[PDB]
Amino acid sequence: DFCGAIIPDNFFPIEKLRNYTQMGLIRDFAKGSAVIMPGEEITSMIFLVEGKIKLDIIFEDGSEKLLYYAGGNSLIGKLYPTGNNIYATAMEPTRTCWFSEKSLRTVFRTDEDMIFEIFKNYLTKVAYYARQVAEMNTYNPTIRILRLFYELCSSQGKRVGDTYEITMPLSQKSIGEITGVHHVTVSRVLACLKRENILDKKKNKIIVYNLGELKHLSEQTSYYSDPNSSSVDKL
Amino acid sequence: VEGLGKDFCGAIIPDNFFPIEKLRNYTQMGLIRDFAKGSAVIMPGEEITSMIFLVEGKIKLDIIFEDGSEKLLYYAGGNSLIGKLYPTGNNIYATAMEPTRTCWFSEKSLRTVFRTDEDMIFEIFKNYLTKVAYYARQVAEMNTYNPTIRILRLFYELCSSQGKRVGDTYEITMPLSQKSIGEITGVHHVTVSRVLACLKRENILDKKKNKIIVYNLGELKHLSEQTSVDKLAAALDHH
Amino acid sequence: VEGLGKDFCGAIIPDNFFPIEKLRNYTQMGLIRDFAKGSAVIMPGEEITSMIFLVEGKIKLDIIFEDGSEKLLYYAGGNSLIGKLYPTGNNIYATAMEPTRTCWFSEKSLRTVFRTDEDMIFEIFKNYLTKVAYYARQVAEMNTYNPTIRILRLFYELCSSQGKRVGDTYEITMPLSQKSIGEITGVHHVTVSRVLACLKRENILDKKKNKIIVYNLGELKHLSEQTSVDKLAAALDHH
Amino acid sequence: DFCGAIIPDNFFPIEKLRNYTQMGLIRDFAKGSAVIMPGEEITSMIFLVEGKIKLDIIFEDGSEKLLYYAGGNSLIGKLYPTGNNIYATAMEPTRTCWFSEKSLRTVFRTDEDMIFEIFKNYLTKVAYYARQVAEMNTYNPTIRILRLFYELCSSQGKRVGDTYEITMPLSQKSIGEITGVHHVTVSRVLACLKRENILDKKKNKIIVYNLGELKHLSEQTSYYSDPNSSSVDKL
Amino acid sequence: DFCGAIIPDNFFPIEKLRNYTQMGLIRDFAKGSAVIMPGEEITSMIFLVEGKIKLDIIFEDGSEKLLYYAGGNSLIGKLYPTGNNIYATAMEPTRTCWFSEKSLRTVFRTDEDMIFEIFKNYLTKVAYYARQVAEMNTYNPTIRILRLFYELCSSQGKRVGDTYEITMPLSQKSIGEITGVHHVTVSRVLACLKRENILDKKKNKIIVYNLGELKHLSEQTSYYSDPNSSSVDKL
Amino acid sequence: VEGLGKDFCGAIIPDNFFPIEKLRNYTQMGLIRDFAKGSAVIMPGEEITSMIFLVEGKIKLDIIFEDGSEKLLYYAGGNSLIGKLYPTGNNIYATAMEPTRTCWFSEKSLRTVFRTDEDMIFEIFKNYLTKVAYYARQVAEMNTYNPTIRILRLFYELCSSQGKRVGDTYEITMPLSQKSIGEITGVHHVTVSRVLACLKRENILDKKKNKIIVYNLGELKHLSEQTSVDKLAAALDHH
Amino acid sequence: DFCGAIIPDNFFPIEKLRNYTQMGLIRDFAKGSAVIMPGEEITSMIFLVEGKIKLDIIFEDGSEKLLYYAGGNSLIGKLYPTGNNIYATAMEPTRTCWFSEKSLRTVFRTDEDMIFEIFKNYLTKVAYYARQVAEMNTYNPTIRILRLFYELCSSQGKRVGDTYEITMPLSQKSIGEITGVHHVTVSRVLACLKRENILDKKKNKIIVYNLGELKHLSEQTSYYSDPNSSSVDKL
Amino acid sequence: VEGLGKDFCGAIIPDNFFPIEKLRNYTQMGLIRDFAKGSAVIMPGEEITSMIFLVEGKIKLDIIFEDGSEKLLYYAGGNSLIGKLYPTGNNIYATAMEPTRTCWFSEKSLRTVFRTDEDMIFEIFKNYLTKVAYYARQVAEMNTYNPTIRILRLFYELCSSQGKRVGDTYEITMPLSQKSIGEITGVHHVTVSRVLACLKRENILDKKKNKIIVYNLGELKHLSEQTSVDKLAAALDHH
Ligand SMILES: O=C(O)Cc1ccc(O)c(Cl)c1
Ligand SMILES: O=C(O)Cc1ccc(O)c(Cl)c1
Ligand SMILES: O=C(O)Cc1ccc(O)c(Cl)c1
Ligand SMILES: O=C(O)Cc1ccc(O)c(Cl)c1
Ligand SMILES: O=C(O)Cc1ccc(O)c(Cl)c1
Ligand SMILES: O=C(O)Cc1ccc(O)c(Cl)c1
Ligand SMILES: O=C(O)Cc1ccc(O)c(Cl)c1
Ligand SMILES: O=C(O)Cc1ccc(O)c(Cl)c1
Structure with missing residues (x-):
């Protein structure tokens, strides 16, 4: 209760x-x-x-x-x-x-x-x-940031070998303003993504080295769009 | 491994x-x-x-x-x-x-x-x-913080100044409406109703029209000592 | 006097x-x-x-x-x-x-x-x-602060990198679901629906399935620049 | 809207x-x-x-x-x-x-x-x-504090000439914890109440010099309990 | 004392x-x-x-x-x-x-x-x-910001009619980090400078419309470099 | 004009x-x-x-x-x-x-x-x-805030629990070294010396080896109630 | 350097x-x-x-x-x-x-x-x-608090069997105001002292169960008063 | 054990x-x-x-x-x-x-x-x-925070907009007095002198009358990215 x-x-x-x-x-x-x-x-x-x-x-x-x-x-x-x-x-x-x-x-x-x-x-x-x-x-701030990244890569991500590149100047300030997360968390998370070889957020380019992982960590959910939800019970 | x-x-x-x-x-x-x-x-x-x-x-x-x-x-x-x-x-x-x-x-x-x-x-x-x-x-x-705990905190404060021990309970003799409790703690009347329903159900405290019975003062006290995430808001977000 | x-x-x-x-x-x-x-x-x-x-x-x-x-x-x-x-x-x-x-x-x-x-x-x-x-x-x-403005802020950011000027409007060509907008900004899907309904009604911006049309970029921008009192919460508290 | x-x-x-x-x-x-x-x-x-x-x-x-x-x-x-x-x-x-x-x-x-x-x-x-x-x-913090005071005086207020006395040790800390208001606002408000001769909150006694004013400022509302609300329209 | x-x-x-x-x-x-x-x-x-x-x-x-x-x-x-x-x-x-x-x-x-x-x-x-x-x-934060601006204009300011232009991308974040002043003050000050027609800080250009005023407000001091200080007393 | x-x-x-x-x-x-x-x-x-x-x-x-x-x-x-x-x-x-x-x-x-x-x-x-x-x-x-006021605050607290009224003064009978006062309040021994020199000079309080005499309790109290700018630091910055 | x-x-x-x-x-x-x-x-x-x-x-x-x-x-x-x-x-x-x-x-x-x-x-x-x-x-806040306690016990501590009692109403608010330490640290420290059986700070009494430990943790220093410091070198 | x-x-x-x-x-x-x-x-x-x-x-x-x-x-x-x-x-x-x-x-x-x-x-x-x-x-x-790092941060910012690479160094051509550096960063002229003496000694950067030579930009940058305890104050408290 x-x-x-x-x-x-x-x-x-x-x-x-x-x-x-x-x-x-x-x-x-x-x-x-x-x-x-x-x-x-x-x-x-x-x-x-x-x-x-x-x-x-x-x-x-x-x-x-x-x-x-x-x-x-x-x-x-x-x-x-x-x-x-x-x-x-x-x-x-x-x-x-x-x-x-x-x-x-x-x-x-x-x-x-x-x-x-x-x-x-x-x-x-x-x-x-x-x-x-x-x-x-439900509104975990790290995940907010990761979901931003994943979403930008999915629409604007240009493939470059193993990587994807996203050509835009997205500031840390902008990230915090869009997501609603404090600057301290933004940096910490951005430092983690870079040292772990997932994503590096430069000034005018975002590079994603491990889209699969980024996607993993972003915690995508889809019950309501997935065909599993087309009936109350299993097939 | x-x-x-x-x-x-x-x-x-x-x-x-x-x-x-x-x-x-x-x-x-x-x-x-x-x-x-x-x-x-x-x-x-x-x-x-x-x-x-x-x-x-x-x-x-x-x-x-x-x-x-x-x-x-x-x-x-x-x-x-x-x-x-x-x-x-x-x-x-x-x-x-x-x-x-x-x-x-x-x-x-x-x-x-x-x-x-x-x-x-x-x-x-x-x-x-x-x-x-x-x-x-x-x-x-x-x-975490939880605004509903302000309500407990009010009851604890009133109990410790006005409560008379009856058996293993404390009885506070005063009318204190739900509306007033909300106004004091800055929480919606409807949330206050639910908080007081929980307190009664779980045998913490029962707020009657002119009396408050406290069944577990120690628990009330330590619960009242609490408080990034508003847990009340989190509990409500999903209806 | x-x-x-x-x-x-x-x-x-x-x-x-x-x-x-x-x-x-x-x-x-x-x-x-x-x-x-x-x-x-x-x-x-x-x-x-x-x-x-x-x-x-x-x-x-x-x-x-x-x-x-x-x-x-x-x-x-x-x-x-x-x-x-x-x-x-x-x-x-x-x-x-x-x-x-x-x-x-x-x-x-x-x-x-x-x-x-x-x-x-x-x-x-x-x-x-x-x-x-x-x-x-x-x-x-x-x-005051207002979490819904994060949604505007997202649209402004996408407009300024991806928007093509058509007449007095800017067209952003991308599918961006309401669910995703909520997830990014940390606001409930149902609130996001209402925010986007307002934006469209007041001729700020219309979020379609695969396109976003921005009718008033300057207004969007300056509204997006905003933010003790959560005004979203205050607007909702009274159903 | x-x-x-x-x-x-x-x-x-x-x-x-x-x-x-x-x-x-x-x-x-x-x-x-x-x-x-x-x-x-x-x-x-x-x-x-x-x-x-x-x-x-x-x-x-x-x-x-x-x-x-x-x-x-x-x-x-x-x-x-x-x-x-x-x-x-x-x-x-x-x-x-x-x-x-x-x-x-x-x-x-x-x-x-x-x-x-x-x-x-x-x-x-x-x-x-x-x-x-x-x-x-709707949840103005000053008014929260004033409403506390008014409510304690109405139940526990003992009349002493022109004043009411409330015999309890209510700390500023306790006030802020009950009301949810920051310590800075609590002091400011308590200083205002005292210099204006409305109420003085001592360590083990609360004195109310001007209950009528305190009541005024506390913004009592009562439409829903008042007989005015017993019908949709005026008498 | x-x-x-x-x-x-x-x-x-x-x-x-x-x-x-x-x-x-x-x-x-x-x-x-x-x-x-x-x-x-x-x-x-x-x-x-x-x-x-x-x-x-x-x-x-x-x-x-x-x-x-x-x-x-x-x-x-x-x-x-x-x-x-x-x-x-x-x-x-x-x-x-x-x-x-x-x-x-x-x-x-x-x-x-x-x-x-x-x-x-x-x-x-x-x-x-x-x-x-x-x-x-002594370390007024507004003046810190103004002194930054004045100093950048004096070295890097390129004259363009009535104005001076400073061609660099100095972020608000950077301003606050250099000066040690909180972001809220940085914005307020930057909004004041712009609405008063003194200086407008764009993303990759700084324009100074009224260098004389900016200089005024920046509170330049120079006793110790000025010839007035070459003797203890007036000439 | x-x-x-x-x-x-x-x-x-x-x-x-x-x-x-x-x-x-x-x-x-x-x-x-x-x-x-x-x-x-x-x-x-x-x-x-x-x-x-x-x-x-x-x-x-x-x-x-x-x-x-x-x-x-x-x-x-x-x-x-x-x-x-x-x-x-x-x-x-x-x-x-x-x-x-x-x-x-x-x-x-x-x-x-x-x-x-x-x-x-x-x-x-x-x-x-x-x-x-x-x-x-x-x-x-x-x-503004001023760390030296912590010292006053300590004296006020000790006066109000331990002070005996003698004429228009309060006498606190206890040895409390300058070193200890610094350690408690987290301020340098040398600053504590200067603070106590001021207090004595201005007839607020005199801290002796085994007694503290308070000449003006009300003033001490209200001064002790105080506290972006560290005024102690500002007073020192210019030697 | x-x-x-x-x-x-x-x-x-x-x-x-x-x-x-x-x-x-x-x-x-x-x-x-x-x-x-x-x-x-x-x-x-x-x-x-x-x-x-x-x-x-x-x-x-x-x-x-x-x-x-x-x-x-x-x-x-x-x-x-x-x-x-x-x-x-x-x-x-x-x-x-x-x-x-x-x-x-x-x-x-x-x-x-x-x-x-x-x-x-x-x-x-x-x-x-x-x-x-x-x-x-040098100004560790926990130690500030502990040093307060130790000092009050040394002057005002009344022995009661194994314990010392200090009869005064020292509030947490007062502790933070005297020491200059934030309320959050004050509580944490006060909770530690109590659960570890060193000292319990009640409203109108302070009890010290383990003065020796409290003293230990308070980090007393005394080179300059100690006779060791009466000469530059060892005896 | x-x-x-x-x-x-x-x-x-x-x-x-x-x-x-x-x-x-x-x-x-x-x-x-x-x-x-x-x-x-x-x-x-x-x-x-x-x-x-x-x-x-x-x-x-x-x-x-x-x-x-x-x-x-x-x-x-x-x-x-x-x-x-x-x-x-x-x-x-x-x-x-x-x-x-x-x-x-x-x-x-x-x-x-x-x-x-x-x-x-x-x-x-x-x-x-x-x-x-x-x-x-x-x-x-x-x-911890350290106000002296504001000085490094200024140098890094100037280097990245105005620095010309000469060998393994960057040369910034501009007169920038110690007084001005203090005024901008809100730190005492005497502390600024000491900061710049360290930078030179440790081969980070040398601030001359009309030129700044940066010997280690990467180090400067990452040092500049830093910042309860003011470490500058802590370093000075003991003369
Ligand atoms: O079913 C639940 O409510 C929670 C849950 C889920 C998975 C598990 O393996 C367990 Cl023990 C419980
Ligand atoms: O001991 C723990 O870490 C967690 C815990 C505490 C109490 C319990 O009754 C259980 Cl099942 C687990
Ligand atoms: O000028 C004011 O103080 C308030 C104001 C502003 C704009 C308006 O259209 C009106 Cl009616 C009033
Ligand atoms: O009726 C309203 O919504 C607000 C209101 C109330 C009283 C007045 O005198 C006015 Cl002009 C408006
Ligand atoms: O001389 C002073 O210390 C301060 C000062 C300066 C100028 C004046 O016009 C006055 Cl009344 C005082
Ligand atoms: O009344 C004022 O605004 C300032 C003030 C206060 C007290 C005095 O003794 C003087 Cl000269 C001025
Ligand atoms: O002597 C020092 O400066 C520090 C120190 C003290 C004790 C030791 O055991 C060591 Cl390795 C160093
Ligand atoms: O590895 C550590 O935990 C600490 C460390 C780091 C670098 C070094 O060169 C040494 Cl001796 C120790």
């Missing part, structure tokens, strides 16, 4: 995991205690029996941002290392049950259904964050 | 989430479906209830928003798994980028796979976890 | 646009209507085709937008004229703030006034001109 | 004024010439017979902004001084006819209808700019 | 004006009271007998800034209207004596010396604020 | 501060000195103790800073007065821009003028007041 | 390495060619025989910045992986000689002196970049 | 650059010196020409700038090497933080070590390379 633009809370609760706490390790955390300490490597699924946990991510510049909140019957799915520094705080008296991989095998040997509850929990999280990323990058 | 994908100018293009070579050994228990270049592997109204394993080929996976905008989520190569075992809120369009062979694993067939090979459970868990880790980091990393 | 209104923190609150004491001498030629405090002098669906002269009292004049938002335009005291002789696009709500006497001058009665007193024409002109001067300055003074 | 958010052009053309050019002064302007020079005091209505004029406003900091464009049959209504420094440029060969007040009397003595055409032209301009100002100030 | 970059206080005290308070009007102001209200037109010199006054200026956007502080024996020199909205506040119990022009004539008829004390007070203020303006505009 | 000067792009170039036509009637009581185009009317080491009245011509008046930088203060035409009757801290260089006649009025000769014409006193007052009004507004109008 | 604030060029040339090119691999690069490609792992010292190389660093956000320029007799010291993505470009026809570790052993077996030339080259680079880092962080 | 140092809020505090355990086996060939807690291992005027190996203990290493400011460069624990074999431009103050044993290796003793163990050469190379990598990244990572 639209609620999830505002509140990241209560992902797919698994009440029934409550019945299997004897196969895990119960751990209690006071208000303000760290369930996951900054830099701690977690290798357990953490079931939230009773209480409230705030779960945040810590970036390499020291900044922290919220990922989500968890309450009764929530599951933190951090069975393996991820590459994200996470920290999590008990915001009230909190009882958890930690499930190691070994302990999970034991649960699923007794109850196969729990495999699929956990899958639903994971899927719910993927669906939510992937959707947010896509919404928030 | 290969990671998740190549980087261009600071962004990864994921084409290889946590592959599972070993599911090749269990394809006999699923359903093998072949797709020609350009073909739809998943159509946006299609109801998908199978994990889809990529034996050979390459798939482009996009989301389709209700306003008809389309956006790439990821590419999939050999040994990638599309984990769409249950309905999600999202309409997905995925196409074969080249001649492609897939194995579709219903829940029942996965049950069968796991009865033969328990380790496969954790391989699938690993795959899901890479995906959550990737997308959650992508969202958190964005420099 | 009094000007247009008092200032608070850098903003004038207009309560006294160019008064016309002398219209008091011509009220016999109009229609006198009295309003009690709180009463509606103008309702938002009402069709107004009279200039309304304020003999005694005070009026608050607001605009009502289609989404139901309301906003003050001005206050009127004694000797103020409300110049609403013809329909405008705007829905207006005006209320008496105190016991108020008005004289309503239809076109016919104004004809009569001007046959007796020619100078009154220029007094009314003076009043209108103060209003245009005030509001135009208010708009221009705002730090 | 929504077009007018993008294009300020062609306000209410008066074709028929073409028939009265002999009573005015015809003036021709080359491309790039100034029809109205920066700082020039204009006291004439300027009818645009043929061509195109760009009309701009110049601010006291040297900045210039567009007001509008004019073409055939447009009228520039600058019969009297306005307080705005305007400048206007012929963007192509342009023929105009300038009407002094004296000359206008002559026109209206021959044709009374022209009075009302000009009224429509003026009204069209007022309607347009007033509408733009209101749209663009 | 360097103190005055930090503290604008105690301008040239005139102790002896204390002896002439009977010829003026004594006025007492409580702590927090307004000695000069916002918008009040003052036509009196205000001698500060005892206490402390903070004196500020209010701009047309509602912003206020400090001009200075006054204490015992200070003089506020506001005998005539100035064009500045000033407001001044008693920061403690404060006794003042207000001198109208009539009252000042009476003082100077008794004591001619007081004329010259007041002159010194005025001169001290001029010396201080003029010095601050000059220090703070 | 003419004001103070012409405007370019938002800035006035003053060439005509409050002229005094009537001093023409009193030149017999001063000393008439003529200057050719390019000539120095005032040299930067010259000690000036006369008001200099401009009978005919035009003068360019600059300040010379100790590092040798030069900057225009104003131009003077006919009927302008240069009010440099006493030494100021400033080194002034003024040159004739054209053939120029001046009348130099010592204090004694002004005494004589005022014995004949009392009104001239107030004319000179008017002239001075225009100058103060102009330059003070110019300074206040600039968007 | 002060030149090195502006120009990072010509670090300690080793002319004599020219004599040992037969023990390395000569490689020639055209103008615009990549000597070190983005993402390339280099494990060789690269001697610059003839030409000019621009050497840059690429950050994880796609931004690139210059490290330095190299010319004849320069040495790029990238014998082992570093953790920095480097790319380097021949800005004219360029001849290099690449020395593997094996090849370097061969050089030093023939000429022991070359070991020490290379040491000087490395030392010159360390001396330069370390000096730049220190200059540029 | 341990890396280079602990991180606080995004910054590493280096306390352990590339340790060399194996130098413990060669201490007999150096000179063993012991230091008590608080003692100076390196004084700021001391001429250091030895690599200093840390056998046991801990050292704090600071730079002292000419204005007397002091700043930490790094800490050293066991197996750290201080690589100060030759004079650098920097004045270094290093103190024992605890009881500390060191071995000082002159050039001659290192020659001896390398005759016994060739591998030690590359260990020392590794240590130096970690240091360069760390500090260079720290500098590049900072958001």
